[PDB]
Design an enzyme around this catalytic site. Structure first.
Site, PDB file in Angstrom:
ATOM      1  CG  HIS A 163      -2.166  -0.851   1.042  1.00 37.56           C
ATOM      2  ND1 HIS A 163      -3.436  -0.410   1.342  1.00 37.56           N
ATOM      3  CD2 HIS A 163      -2.302  -2.127   0.598  1.00 37.56           C
ATOM      4  CE1 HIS A 163      -4.302  -1.386   1.126  1.00 37.56           C
ATOM      5  NE2 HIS A 163      -3.642  -2.439   0.674  1.00 37.56           N
ATOM      6  CB  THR A 216       4.950   7.932  -3.840  1.00 37.58           C
ATOM      7  OG1 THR A 216       4.780   7.447  -2.487  1.00 37.58           O
ATOM      8  CG2 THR A 216       4.118   9.188  -4.038  1.00 37.58           C
TER       9      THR A 216
HETATM   10 CA   LIG Z   1       5.146   5.341  -1.378  1.00 31.67          CA
END
Ligand SMILES: [Ca+2]
Ligand code: HEM
Ligand SMILES: CCCCCCCCCO[C@@H]1O[C@H](CO)[C@@H](O)[C@H](O)[C@H]1O
Ligand SMILES: [Ca+2]
Ligand SMILES: [Ca+2]
Ligand SMILES: [Ca+2]
Ligand SMILES: [Ca+2]
Ligand SMILES: [Cl-]
Ligand SMILES: [Cl-]
Ligand SMILES: [Cl-]
Length: 639
Positions: A163, A216
């Site tokens: 996640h 990211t």
């Molecule tokens: Ca990340």
């Protein structure tokens, strides 16, 4: 001399497997010699049977070769105009401005790179049928667990990391898979619909299209902070740098729809919510420590420092605690600790500082980030090797924490809860009744599933998937069949080609892969005898494991290079891992936290004393005590 030695390197090609003769041509002279040595060891006494010091020497050389030959850029590098990294001494909301030479590297929506060259499989997305593969080879028959090695906290943890790391951008186009007559009676769904992976043109000849990562890829704890400014804003209280949490229960807050409020809750469950809550507590405790030191720090300042500390604590715990339980061998205990602290060790580094080289001092605290000439990303291949859904059980075993603990702090079962009641929105409701302590202790005491064939939770073969914001979709999926489809759709090499791409000796027959005779017969049936058609996920589950390894060696070599890369490529673990950036107290907080146990003990001071008998919080908690091995670590021989 170089030309003459090149001629000898063409002579020694007679000792290299024919399938590597192509990658060999790409290689420098020294690297050709190194491949000869690595390949030689592979054909003799394998690295995992060598004395630890020689095992580590092998892994250092193999890792170097992967760094040179198994990092492939995808798409034009998002360089942008030149910027000063001193202007960005903190983790930005969308991951921009980390790579001092490319503003967009590691940011949300950046391209997934590759480790292995792509294999176009558009003509065989359904060959063999992915629902047939799911039914015959993946769906759980009899539950197989990981003994005492790797508990449900450890299973929650790796999802908690996914996640932070990786999620593929979808297109709007819908795909439908249909169950063939042969297996329909054994498929929870007779058909299912999902979204195509978005295939974005790159503008290059080598790799013409790529996927985009909506998390990211920096190891920046976006799992609690979000992957952009909008999602960050949702978790911030704007008081004292802090993040949202229930002060009363220590659980996550929920929105008006009953959805948890954190960084990324997509396709989540109670175990992940527990870790999100624990690390929000960690972040908030860092804020308290820093606000006390310095009353001139505003909310934004506190948030930035606390995020640096918290994300570094998480990476450290993953590296030297979690991975050490996944890969429960002496060689990997030594190797993973060396990633963080170097061969010279923690005591030396803490006393005298960084030795200067990654080998001696660790990748952490190196003077400059290192990308080996390829912009940082997490890759398509990385996604595939982290597909570990068979870790999940059918039910969670909730223990009676009101009972007096028995031998090894064991506790009796009080209720079994179907995993269906513990996932998504329903899972948040169930967790509200169970509570943090009861869930955490129960997870500590429960073994994960093993990464073997025929061990894929059947409940995942009919699940409600989510939009990126955690909202339920009307179209259910058979996750086992879908994962097979995705690996093909995204042109990740199938098992044998993946091995060749990573200079591993390919299999010639099923017996090379596994000793399980009934599994061999199923493989032979599904793949019509053809080892070249064997799916990556299937091969990774099927592969005979190294003693102590929860994962295949094929997966491990991707872990070997990419785990190191997540640390070494990031300014905040290297050039900017220092007291100026983290504060003195912030850096101290990282440097004195060694384990998940340390974090649990900080927030729940009595939990592990009462209920954890293992050394690591990621091992099954009622493990018997172990006497330390008196043989020096670097000299140990595996049996
Ligand atoms: Ca990340
Ligand atoms: C209750 C727990 C979980 C649920 C409900 C769940 C569900 C899902 C779903 C629906 C997808 C997307 C399928 C698609 O559209 O392509 C997915 C992807 C994925 N999951 Fe899980 N999962 C769970 C736990 C885990 C665990 C324990 C792991 C272990 C590492 C894991 C690793 C992954 C990975 C690597 C992907 C691929 C991400 C990508 O394509 O970028 N998941 N999961
Ligand atoms: C970069 C490569 C890293 C090191 C490779 C060295 C392998 C050679 C080791 O052979 C030595 O003699 C034995 C014969 O009995 C071996 O089996 C034993 O393990 C070892 O002690
Ligand atoms: Ca607000
Ligand atoms: Ca001050
Ligand atoms: Ca027990
Ligand atoms: Ca049979
Ligand atoms: Cl958004
Ligand atoms: Cl890892
Ligand atoms: Cl440290």
């Amino acid at each position: 001399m170089k030309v003459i030695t090149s001629l000898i390197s063409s002579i020694l090609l007679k000792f290299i497997h024919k399938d590597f003769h192509e990658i060999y041509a790409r290689m420098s002279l020294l690297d050709r010699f190194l491949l000869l040595i690595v390949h030689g060891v592979d054909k003799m006494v394998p690295w995992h049977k060598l004395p630890v010091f020689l095992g580590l020497t092998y892994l250092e050389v193999r890792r170097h070769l992967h760094q040179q030959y198994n990092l492939l850029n995808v798409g034009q590098t998002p360089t942008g105009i030149r910027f000063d990294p001193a202007n960005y001494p903190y983790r930005t909301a969308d991951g921009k401005f980390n790579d001092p030479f490319n503003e967009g590297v590691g940011s949300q929506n950046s391209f997934f790179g590759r480790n292995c060259p792509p294999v176009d499989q558009k003509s065989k997305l359904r060959r063999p049928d992915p629902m047939v593969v799911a039914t015959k080879l993946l769906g759980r028959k009899k539950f197989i667990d990981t003994g005492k090695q790797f508990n449900m906290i450890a299973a929650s943890w790796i999802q908690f990391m996914i996640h932070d790391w990786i999620d593929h951008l979808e297109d709007t186009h819908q795909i439908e898979l249909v169950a063939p007559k042969e297996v329909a009676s054994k498929c929870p769904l007779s058909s299912f619909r999902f979204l195509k992976t978005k295939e974005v043109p790159t503008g290059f000849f080598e790799i013409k299209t790529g996927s985009q990562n909506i998390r990211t890829p920096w190891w920046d704890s976006s799992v609690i902070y979000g992957s952009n400014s909008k999602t960050l804003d949702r978790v911030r209280t704007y008081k004292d740098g802090k993040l949202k949490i229930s002060e009363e229960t220590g659980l996550l807050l929920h929105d008006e729809d009953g959805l948890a409020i954190s960084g990324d809750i997509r396709n989540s469950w109670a175990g992940v919510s527990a870790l999100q809550a624990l690390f929000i507590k960690e972040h908030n405790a860092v804020c308290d420590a820093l606000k006390d030191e310095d009353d001139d720090l505003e909310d934004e300042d506190l948030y930035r420092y606390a995020r640096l500390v918290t994300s570094a604590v998480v990476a450290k715990i993953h590296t030297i605690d979690w991975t050490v339980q996944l890969l429960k061998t002496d060689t990997l205990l030594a190797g993973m600790r060396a990633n963080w602290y170097g061969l010279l060790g923690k005591k030396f580094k803490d006393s005298f500082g960084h030795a200067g080289s990654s080998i001696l001092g660790g990748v952490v605290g190196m003077k400059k980030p290192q990308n080996h000439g390829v912009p940082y990303s997490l890759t398509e291949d990385f996604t595939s090797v982290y597909r570990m859904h068979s870790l999940l059980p059918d039910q969670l075993h909730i223990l009676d924490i009101d009972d007096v603990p028995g031998t090894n702090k064991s506790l009796p079962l009080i209720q079994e809860i179907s995993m269906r009641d513990l996932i998504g929105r329903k899972g948040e409701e169930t967790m509200s009744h169970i509570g943090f302590t009861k869930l955490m202790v129960s997870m500590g005491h429960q073994a994960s599933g093993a990464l073997e064939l025929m061990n894929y939770p059947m409940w995942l073969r009919d699940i409600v998937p989510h939009d990126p914001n955690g909202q339920a979709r009307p179209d259910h999926v058979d996750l086992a069949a879908l994962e097979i489809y995705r690996d093909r759709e995204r042109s990740v090499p199938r098992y044998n080609e993946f091995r060749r791409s990573m200079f591993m000796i390919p299999i010639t027959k099923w017996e090379d892969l596994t000793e399980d005779e009934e599994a061999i017969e199923v493989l032979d049936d599904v793949y019509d005898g053809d080892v070249e058609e064997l799916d990556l996920l299937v091969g990774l589950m099927a592969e005979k494991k190294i003693k102590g390894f929860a994962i295949s060696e094929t997966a491990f070599y991707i872990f070997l290079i990419m785990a190191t890369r997540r640390l070494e490529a990031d300014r905040f673990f290297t050039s900017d891992f220092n007291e100026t950036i983290y504060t003195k107290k912030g850096l101290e907080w990282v440097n004195t936290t060694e384990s998940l146990k340390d974090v649990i003990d900080r927030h729940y001071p009595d939990m592990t004393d009462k209920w954890m008998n293992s050394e690591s919080a990621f091992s099954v908690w009622d493990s018997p005590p172990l006497t330390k091995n008196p043989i020096p670590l670097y000299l140990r021989i595996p049996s």
